[PDB]
Design a protein around this nucleic acid. Structure first.
Lengths: 418, 473, 102
RNA sequence: UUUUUUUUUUUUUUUUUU
DNA sequence: AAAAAAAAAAAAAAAA
């Protein structure tokens, strides 16, 4: 018994209308056959359609558009549909559906000119209502309406080519792991030895004042040059602590509480980082809160480290990749790095208009996808390195902080493909 | 080499009990849940702007297409998706003469001119609501571009066109939606550029806001907002457990009164007897002194949580068995002790903080594409990172443009299992009714609470504001 | 009773003598508008609550309380519920009409 | 403000030490 | 008047 509804259309142009109408009709309980519905193709399909139009099709719906009007496959399907119409002696068999505003009723195909067409040009809902009323009137075979059929067909056919798949993927973060710290954090009682109205940011090694204790990983007499009075200090006055205990969280006392003892390691490593960036002779832009470190035009061979460009041109603006670093110790002892792009007029002097810099940064980052961010970040941090595996922050005459040159890696069990 | 868990993508419910991962595709095939017979629309504005509204309504009557259907689904037409009538015939039109708008706009005082422009529209809207037999569901407020350029804070009127209240913000939208709160009139503001933009062009000649490829999604984001504002339920959640109220606090700054006073506002989402979700505001705005405190004093915290529990008791009968109080800021013990007292024994209070500040940015080894959305790095049973912004295959692209930034989700207070906390926030990022997008970059409670706070801090004379979002978004 | 009466309303309604008063052919026939029992936003008034106010000796106080009970729910539905309602049908029992008048 | 996203500007507070 | 560690208000562009 014929109970299938055939929807002929121009395959590569009328995907949207055919898809919507088919997914509506199947949910309504009407059997629908179409080429886009069936997933996979073979040589047999050209034969298959024919037998359907001759053996199972009870109604034939022709999508009428400027594309499908003169499409050879559509024309062949129309011919076989007209001839099976003749053989069935049923005149209300082919039901054209006009969906194009630019295809007037005076330019339709010859097989369709004399056939009334359901108007979809204005409202698709009105056309679908007309289709339902006509199919009900002509007593077309129908099953109970069930939208779950439409949902299942959507899942097996269309969200089907783009689905969750399980396969391991490894990701590269922006966190540089800290391999080791100096053994003991030193609290030296300079007191009157260090002038109170003095600034510790100019000190040779990083050091922060807390009460009358200078806190640093540096040795007692490393600050002799900037502080000539410190030659007569006594090393038994230090409050050296096993920093690894601080990282574990074991150490806490009235002298210092571990939460405010972790901050004295975060400012310390931040000053170490900025000092190291000064050592590498990379220039800086002042941000609203932080500071960014970018490189000149010409310091790198052809303005690129490794094979990847870091300083480039854009009309009259020289753009430079820059990083901002900050030591964080809550998840792990790590240094977080963020990426930025800053523009200059001549490659050396920063453009003073913040709005222009922001707009040009947006213009440049318009086309910077994952392999433009990760690659430049990794190239910059490798240029920052001292060896092939890690670098060190200068913490004293003999104390260093060892930080890996490769970002922290995680392991994902689910990924995808283009 | 640290483990990274993946949470299944949430599914939202549509008509006939059918579930679909996408909102656009599910809506375009199954339609909304409730039968809203028709949208009686009222419009305010000039004659030049009314033609554009009529043209756009006629456009969205017919189907529209995007550049690529896979990345952005096609729009089958308003009545096609929403099975509800919304035509250009039957719109109640109210006039705003160009002389009236130019008389007030060209004023030196930004506060005074914005107050006058809001007053001009609001007087006519209230007069039409009160003194006309026509019933209009939503009042589409067409505003020109000159009002857009010269009626917001920090807007400098050029010296050549300056021809000639301070308790209200210079923001047209915030003040506008604030002063209509007493009358409970659902409204939506439209730029003339958001309308048929092809008229507005730059010096190069291409439209300033060229939306050639994004016409379909523009229609999706306008149609869904119009349907929600008329009293529709486009979609809901399905995996949310019974007895789980959420509640979301956010703090906004108030400039008019001395001391910013840090108004705190909340939006409450939970279940109803049956199967329908209820996502309203829980608005008792509790102002907090101190310049930058953002921690709420015990009396106001008690009042807030008591009101939140009562709005659940009155609609279900008994108190929630487990709530997830989300917030943008960390919880001090002072608030939590106050919260604990109000709640009974059976309730399990949970205080969660969600933030984007810390720069964790996962880069995959190869490929011009970002991490999957749903990837989570669990730091510990109390803290985790969830990539609610990222790639999803269904929309063919990542929701972000550059590499995305995840959400640091930590359980400051209560106990809560981190997996379930990560399971509800990702689902909570699906109920964005102001826009029809596959997913939202942040949970909607922290977003719609932000919106209602941005509206409630514009008028200092507000009193007992409505709890429905349609008056706010 | 309201639901039953509306269900009656969509169907045609007949009086004794159509010559005197034309027959009612149905809401959707003459007003060609959709007015169906589906979509009625319902707010309940329990019998106990309406009985507490009703049995009062003072006419004015009972009237004010009865009006407050309805108007509070109406305002709450108008301002704190997503549904939009064109009209608010207020079905009041007959004992109130008997005993809430001057 | 149809949106959303990613940034760029400020500003500000708390904890602590002088 | 500094610091780090957390906060929000506003404008600009661009793609969804």
């Amino acid at each position: 018994m014929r109970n299938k509804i055939f929807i002929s259309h121009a395959t590569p142009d009328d995907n949207d209308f055919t898809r919507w109408l088919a997914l509506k009709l199947i949910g309504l309980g009407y059997e629908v056959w179409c080429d886009i519905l069936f997933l996979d193709k073979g040589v047999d399909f050209w034969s298959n359609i024919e037998k359907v139009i001759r053996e199972d099709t009870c109604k034939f719906l022709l999508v009428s558009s400027s594309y499908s009007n003169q499409r050879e496959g559509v024309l062949k399907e129309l011919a076989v549909a007209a001839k099976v119409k003749k053989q069935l002696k049923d005149d209300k068999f082919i039901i054209p559906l006009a969906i194009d505003e630019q295809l007037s009723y005076d330019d339709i195909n010859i097989d369709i000119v004399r056939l009334n067409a359901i108007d979809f040009k204005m409202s698709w809902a009105r056309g679908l209502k007309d289709i339902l009323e006509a199919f009900e009137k002509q007593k077309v075979p129908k099953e109970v309406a069930d939208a779950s059929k439409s949902n299942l067909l959507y899942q097996q056919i269309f969200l089907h080519d783009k689905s969750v798949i399980e396969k391991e993927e490894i990701y590269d973060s922006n966190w540089l792991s800290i391999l080791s710290f100096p053994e003991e954090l030193r609290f030296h009682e300079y007191n009157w030895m260090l002038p109170k109205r003095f600034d510790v940011r100019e000190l040779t090694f990083p050091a922060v004042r807390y009460k009358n204790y200078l806190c640093t990983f540096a040795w007692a007499y490393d600050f002799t040059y900037h502080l000539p009075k410190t030659e007569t200090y006594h090393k038994s006055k230090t409050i050296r602590i096993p920093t690894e205990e601080i990282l574990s969280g074991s150490y806490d006392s009235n002298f210092i509480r571990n939460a405010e003892c972790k901050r004295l390691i975060v400012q310390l490593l931040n000053k170490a980082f900025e000092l190291r960036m000064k050592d590498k002779e990379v220039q800086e832009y002042e941000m609203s809160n932080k500071t960014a470190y970018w490189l000149e035009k010409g310091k790198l061979e052809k303005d690129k480290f490794e094979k990847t460009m870091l300083v480039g041109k854009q009309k009259d603006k020289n753009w430079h990749f820059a990083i901002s670093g900050a030591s964080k110790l809550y998840p792990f002892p790590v240094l977080m790095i963020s990426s930025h792009i800053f523009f200059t007029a001549d490659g050396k002097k920063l453009i003073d208009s913040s709005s222009v810099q922001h707009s040009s940064r947006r213009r440049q980052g318009k086309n910077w996808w994952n392999n433009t961010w990760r690659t430049k970040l990794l190239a910059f941090i490798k240029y920052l390195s001292d060896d092939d595996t890690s670098f060190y922050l200068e913490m004293g005459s003999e104390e260093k902080v060892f930080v890996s040159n490769e970002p922290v890696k995680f392991k994902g069990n689910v990924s995808y493909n283009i | 080499m640290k483990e990274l868990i993946y949470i299944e993508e949430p599914k939202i419910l549509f008509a006939h009990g059918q579930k679909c991962t996408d909102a656009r595709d599910g809506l375009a095939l199954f339609g909304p849940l409730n039968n809203l017979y028709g949208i009686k629309s009222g419009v305010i504005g000039t004659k030049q702007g009314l033609k554009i509204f009529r043209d756009y309504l006629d456009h969205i009557q017919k189907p529209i297409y995007n550049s690529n259907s896979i990345t952005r689904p096609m729009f089958p037409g308003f009545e096609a998706v929403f099975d509800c009538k919304w035509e250009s015939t039957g719109i109640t039109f109210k006039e705003v003469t160009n002389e009236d708008i130019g008389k007030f706009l060209y004023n030196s005082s930004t506060h005074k001119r914005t107050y006058d422009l809001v007053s001009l529209f609001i007087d006519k809207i209230i007069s039409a609501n009160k003194n006309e037999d026509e019933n209009v569901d939503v009042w589409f407020v067409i505003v020109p571009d000159e009002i857009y350029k010269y009626c917001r804070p920090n807007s400098v009127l050029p010296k050549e066109m300056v021809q000639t209240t301070y308790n209200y913000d210079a923001q047209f939208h915030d003040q506008f939606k604030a002063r209509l709160l007493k009358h409970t009139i659902p409204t939506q503001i439209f730029r003339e550029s958001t309308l048929a933009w092809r008229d507005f062009k730059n010096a190069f000649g291409l439209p300033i806001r060229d939306f050639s490829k994004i016409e379909g999604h523009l229609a999706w984001t306008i149609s869904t907002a119009a349907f929600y504002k008329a009293g529709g339920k486009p979609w809901k959640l399905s995996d949310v457990r019974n007895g789980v109220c959420y509640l979301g606090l956010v703090y906004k700054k108030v400039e008019k009164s001395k001391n910013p006073r840090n108004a705190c506002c909340a939006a409450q989402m939970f279940l109803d007897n049956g199967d329908g979700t209820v996502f309203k505001g829980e608005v008792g705005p509790w102002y907090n002194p101190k310049n930058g405190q953002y921690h709420l004093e015990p009396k106001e915290a008690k009042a807030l949580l008591s009101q939140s529990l009562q709005s659940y008791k009155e609609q279900i009968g008994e108190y929630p068995k487990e709530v997830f109080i989300h917030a943008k800021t960390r919880f001090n013990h002072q608030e939590w002790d106050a919260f604990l007292e109000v709640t009974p024994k059976e309730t399990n209070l949970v205080g969660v903080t969600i933030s984007k500040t810390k720069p964790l940015k996962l880069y995959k080894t190869e490929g011009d594409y970002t991490i999957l959305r749903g990837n989570a790095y669990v730091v510990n049973e109390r803290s985790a990172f969830l990539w609610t912004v990222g790639y999803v295959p269904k929309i063919q692209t990542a929701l972000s443009m550059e590499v995305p930034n995840p959400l640091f989700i930590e359980i400051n207070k209560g106990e809560a299992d981190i997996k379930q906390v990560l399971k509800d926030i990702l689902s909570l990022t699906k109920l964005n009714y102001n826009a029809c997008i596959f997913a939202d970059g942040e949970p909607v409670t922290l977003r719609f609470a932000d919106k209602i706070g941005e509206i409630l801090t514009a008028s200092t004379d507000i009193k007992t504001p409505p709890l429905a979002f349609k008056y706010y978004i």
